[PDB]
RNA sequence: GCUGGCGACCAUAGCAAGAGUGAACCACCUGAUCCCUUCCCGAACUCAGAAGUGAAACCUCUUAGCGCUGAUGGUAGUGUGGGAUUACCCAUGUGAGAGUAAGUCAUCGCCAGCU
RNA sequence: AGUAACGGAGGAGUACGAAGGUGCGCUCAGCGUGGUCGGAAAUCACGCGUAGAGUAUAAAGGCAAAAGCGCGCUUAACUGC
RNA sequence: CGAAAGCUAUUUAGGUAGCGCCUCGGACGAAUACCAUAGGGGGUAGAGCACUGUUUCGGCUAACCGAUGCAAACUCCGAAUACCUAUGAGUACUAUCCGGGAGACAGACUGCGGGUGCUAACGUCCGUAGUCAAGAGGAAAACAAUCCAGACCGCCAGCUAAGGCCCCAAAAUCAUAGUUAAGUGGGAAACGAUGUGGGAAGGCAAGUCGGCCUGCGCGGAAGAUGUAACGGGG
């Protein structure tokens with residue numbers, strides 16, 4: 063399960079998730095990519111699940127590029143405790159997803175098989191996705 | 200040989216609200232610069248430009264832009280696409 | 296039980312007199328921890344880097360030198 | 372010169388403090404009240420702050 | 429037309445690479461006796477010099493090569509009024525950062541000497 | 544400017560007659576090379592890009608007229624304000 | 625005429641004191657505020673990767689190079705607002721100072737910016753604006769805190785606001801052009817599907833094929849006294 067090897071701080075303010083993904087939204091490594099059309103969180107378990115599904119369908123061919131990395135920690139409180147007494151404990155890690163961001167990219171496959179694998183993986187994600195190909199300007 | 204039939208985009212049609220009104224009726228803003236003349240703001244038709252952007256030869260040879268008895272020989276320089284939908288939003292054209 | 300819960304009392308640092316204002320000799324212009332602003336003409340610097348006016352005039356900020364420093368000065 | 376007539380249209384009781392002061396600084400007292408003011412930039416500024424509850428002819 | 433000093437300004441003014449100068453000025457250069465130095469050393473700081481050379485340096489000229497500067501148009505954000513509630517939409521005012529076209533091998537003041 | 548929570552992270556309850564004043568003076572760290580032990584690192588000598596070194600002590604704001612580092616002489620770590 | 629439910633301290637925490645906020649008297653009148661113009665300093669929103677950290681793929685021999693992301697306690701950058709000063713128009717018993725008398729220091733909800741919690745709570749803690757408190761009238765069926773609006777008294781007079789005009793119940797069974805067949809309207813997701821209206825394109829030769837973008841609908845859809853998820857009739 064992906065997570066940073068070391069961080070400056072353990073705990074992080076909640077924050078809000080607004081705007082669009084202007085930066086990581088262009089195919090830059092392969093031929094075909096899957097993109098988020100909605101916003102949400104993506105835990106490390108979902109990242110690994112979709113990676114396994116894609117690489118199982120693709121028959122270990124081509125290459126898969128993961129372009130999302132989960133680096134924001136999320137805390138929780140233990141069960142049956144009251145509302146004060148400090149911040150909880152880190153339980154898992156997420157990546158924030160704004161609409162437009164490329165999640166996965168595939169290389170070295172004809173588009174039909176890539177689309178079958180992407181349709182398999184889009185069923186294990188919490189938000190709506192789309193498929194995109196490379197283009198010049 | 201490609202040709203995009205444009206129309207003039209004066210002030211009070213430039214800005215953020217004016218450009219959103221333009222796009223809400225399927226038109227695309229654009230700018231033409233280069234050479235020794237001043238830039239020229241322009242409005243193109245979205246379906247025309249979408250149709251042109253599917254041919255790989257449109258990105259290489261000289262395109263003709265007609266803003267009304269005024270023909271310009273330009274190459275496409277930059278393009279802004281929407282991040283979620285791939286809809287083009289702005290196009291830059293260098294006088295060539 | 297946690298290990299946090301401390302802080303200091305405030306210090307009220309900042310610019311007290313702005314550009315174009317008149318000042319008497321002695322008025323404090325800037326309270327700063329370091330030297331974000333430097334002393335120009337008719338301005339002195341205290342032991343805690345306080346910039347104060349040493350003549351009557353009008354305050355003015357600028358940027359000067361080969362290090363691009365911020366200066367404040369008093370015009371009489 | 373230039374003079375304009377301004378009428379208060381909506382209520383002014385739950386507006387921002389400066390929006391109530393803009394109406395008080397033009398001479399307007401209640402809904403339907405109409406006053407005649409000079410057409411200076413300083414009057415136009417107050418008229419521009421409260422465009423949503425006044426009518427200018 | 430080549431200089432020396434003191435400033436304004438602080439890269440469109442800077443680094444790189446190349447080329448040029450020795451009347452004058454400046455620099456290297458000679459000797460350490462005296463003045464004056466070196467936690468050792470005339471290296472540097474000094475003093476008395478004038479056989480040399482423009483080698484190093486400095487200074488002035490060339491080229492965007494690296495840097496620096498930089499629109500227009502669009503996009504993000506946003507005050508006020510209204511509508512929606514996952515953070516948007518409409519009216520009105522405002523408006524970046526990044527990126528693109530393009531620009532730069534400096535401008536000026538006071539003084540002294542040389543031709 | 545100020546601004547709360549059994550909100551998120553760190554320090555203090557000292558040190559120094561020089562680690563204070565002053566005149567004069569200096570410039571870090573990092574790398575490559577050639578050098579007896581001696582090696583990746585002691586001490587030299589020479590080069591190219593450099594603020595990434597330091598500050599008695601936590602962090603921040605600062606630091607070329609260096610506020611960093613030395614040497615001689617000194618007590619302004621004065622009294623009234 | 626008209627508050628506060630705050631700040632600071634307290635063997636203080638449901639008490640009290642100074643300051644803030646109300647009222648009366650005196651002095652003094654433009655010093656005051658709103659707006660325009662002019663002069664200022666920011667490090668937030670956004671963005672970026674120059675530092676501090678962290679992330680992906682490649683090249684070369686941990687580090688350098690190329691391409692690629694992220695940040696409350698990163699910043700080469702950087703607003704809108706807000707705040708401070710001077711000048712000016714118009715409109716306002718404005719602002720200051722000196723005395724007598726206080727109450728109050730349990731707040732609540734709604735919107736915007738956040739911390740905490742599960743981006744749970746009619747939860748809890750701050751900032752900022754509105755209402756209630758201490759505010760009646762009209763609308764939201766009924767409904768402190770929402771929308772419109774601030775009640776000196778009287779009238780069997782008139783115009784409007786929010787919201788409405790088939791009947792209960794005042795006013796259009798009004799006019800023009802469309803969509804829906806689900807009582808959708810009048811409660812709810814991933815996902816499923818030849819429902820139906822519109823649009824920009826393609827392949828093949830009486831047309832046919834399947835693909836995208838869209839308006840409105842369908843399934844997904846189980847609870848306990850009585851229909852009971854339009855107030856009702858309809």
Ligand SMILES: [Mg+2]
Nearest residue numbers: 215216519520
């Ligand atoms: Mg707008």
Ligand SMILES: [Mg+2]
Nearest residue numbers: 501502523524
């Ligand atoms: Mg712009």
Ligand SMILES: [Mg+2]
Nearest residue numbers: 499524525526
């Ligand atoms: Mg710009």
Ligand SMILES: [Mg+2]
Nearest residue numbers: 625626758774
């Ligand atoms: Mg009253």
Ligand SMILES: [Mg+2]
Nearest residue numbers: 636637639729
């Ligand atoms: Mg109390």
Ligand SMILES: [Mg+2]
Nearest residue numbers: 647648649650
């Ligand atoms: Mg009084």
Ligand SMILES: [Mg+2]
Nearest residue numbers: 669670671695
């Ligand atoms: Mg941000």
Ligand SMILES: [Mg+2]
Nearest residue numbers: 629630729730
């Ligand atoms: Mg209390």
Ligand SMILES: [Mg+2]
Nearest residue numbers: 731732749750
């Ligand atoms: Mg409160």
Ligand SMILES: [Mg+2]
Nearest residue numbers: 732746747748
């Ligand atoms: Mg509550």
Ligand SMILES: [Mg+2]
Nearest residue numbers: 629731757758
């Ligand atoms: Mg009460």
Ligand SMILES: [Mg+2]
Nearest residue numbers: 759760761768
């Ligand atoms: Mg009421």
Ligand SMILES: [Mg+2]
Nearest residue numbers: 760761762763
């Ligand atoms: Mg009522």
Ligand SMILES: [Mg+2]
Nearest residue numbers: 762763765766
């Ligand atoms: Mg009622």
Ligand SMILES: [Mg+2]
Nearest residue numbers: 791793794795
């Ligand atoms: Mg009736």
Ligand SMILES: [Mg+2]
Nearest residue numbers: 796797798799
């Ligand atoms: Mg009819």
